[PDB]
Design a protein around this ligand. Structure first.
Ligand SMILES: Nc1ncnc2c1ncn2[C@@H]1O[C@H](COP(=O)(O)OP(=O)(O)O)[C@@H](O)[C@H]1O
Ligand SMILES: [Mg+2]
Lengths: 77, 52, 76
């Protein structure tokens, strides 16, 4: 959480919640005799694919919005 | 001939057995972290330092 | 129910090429119904999500690697 705060400044609660949920589900998989190496490889692949999908589909360029986008982002924060 | 030296002292055998048991215990403890499918160990020092 | 509705909307967006604009649908917490958050002005920087994902994944992997703990008694 401290690193997320230092490097970004927002989403400090979300990163902790996501990490804990990921750990919980990974341990649930491990309890089913799935080897932790396979879980780690799957998590790494899923993270890479999620970043790629976010960058290719879910991004909105701010040039089409203008000054209103900054105000909306600040209000959301 | 027949009987050889009696070896009235059993303490050397006990020392050898204890040494072997300790070494085998160490090997068994660290066996889990061998190979590509091995897993890391968390070690917490007496000062509270943590290493993985 | 809300998460099911949101998942249905996003699945419809992903499977139907002409309904791609449904991917902006998020959660409107005041009314408890799905809402197009891009039009509603609910925005976040992409860096926040990307860095959160990467950091959380790395932390989860780091914890998941552990399968044995040795806790030495303090010298004090
Ligand atoms: N007006 C809003 N409507 C719906 N969701 C929102 C709104 N504002 C913020 N959110 C969402 O709430 C989540 C939690 O944000 P928050 O926890 O306050 O930030 P942080 O994680 O930095 O503490 C964010 O992921 C954001 O997407
Ligand atoms: Mg915030």
């Amino acid at each position: 959480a401290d690193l997320q705060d230092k490097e970004v400044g927002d989403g400090t609660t979300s990163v902790v919640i996501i990490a804990a949920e990921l750990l919980k589900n990974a341990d649930e998989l491990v309890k089913q005799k799935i080897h932790p190496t396979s879980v780690i490889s799957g998590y790494r692949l899923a993270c890479k694919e999620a970043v790629r999908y976010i960058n290719e589909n879910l991004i909105v360029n701010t040039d089409e919005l203008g000054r209103d986008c900054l105000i909306n982002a600040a209000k959301t924060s | 001939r027949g009987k050889g030296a009696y070896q009235d002292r059993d303490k050397p055998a006990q020392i050898r057995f204890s040494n072997i048991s300790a070494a085998k215990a160490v090997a068994d403890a660290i066996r889990t972290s061998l190979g590509p499918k091995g897993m890391d160990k968390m070690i917490q020092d007496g000062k509270g330092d943590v290493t993985i | 129910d809300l998460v099911a509705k949101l998942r249905a909307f996003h699945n419809e967006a992903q499977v139907n090429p002409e309904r791609k604009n449904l991917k902006w649908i998020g959660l409107d917490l005041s009314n408890g119904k799905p809402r197009d958050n891009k039009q509603a002005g609910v925005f976040e920087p992409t860096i926040v999500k990307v860095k959160s994902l990467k950091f959380a994944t790395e932390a989860a992997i780091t914890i998941l690697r552990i399968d044995d703990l040795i806790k030495l008694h303090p010298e004090s």
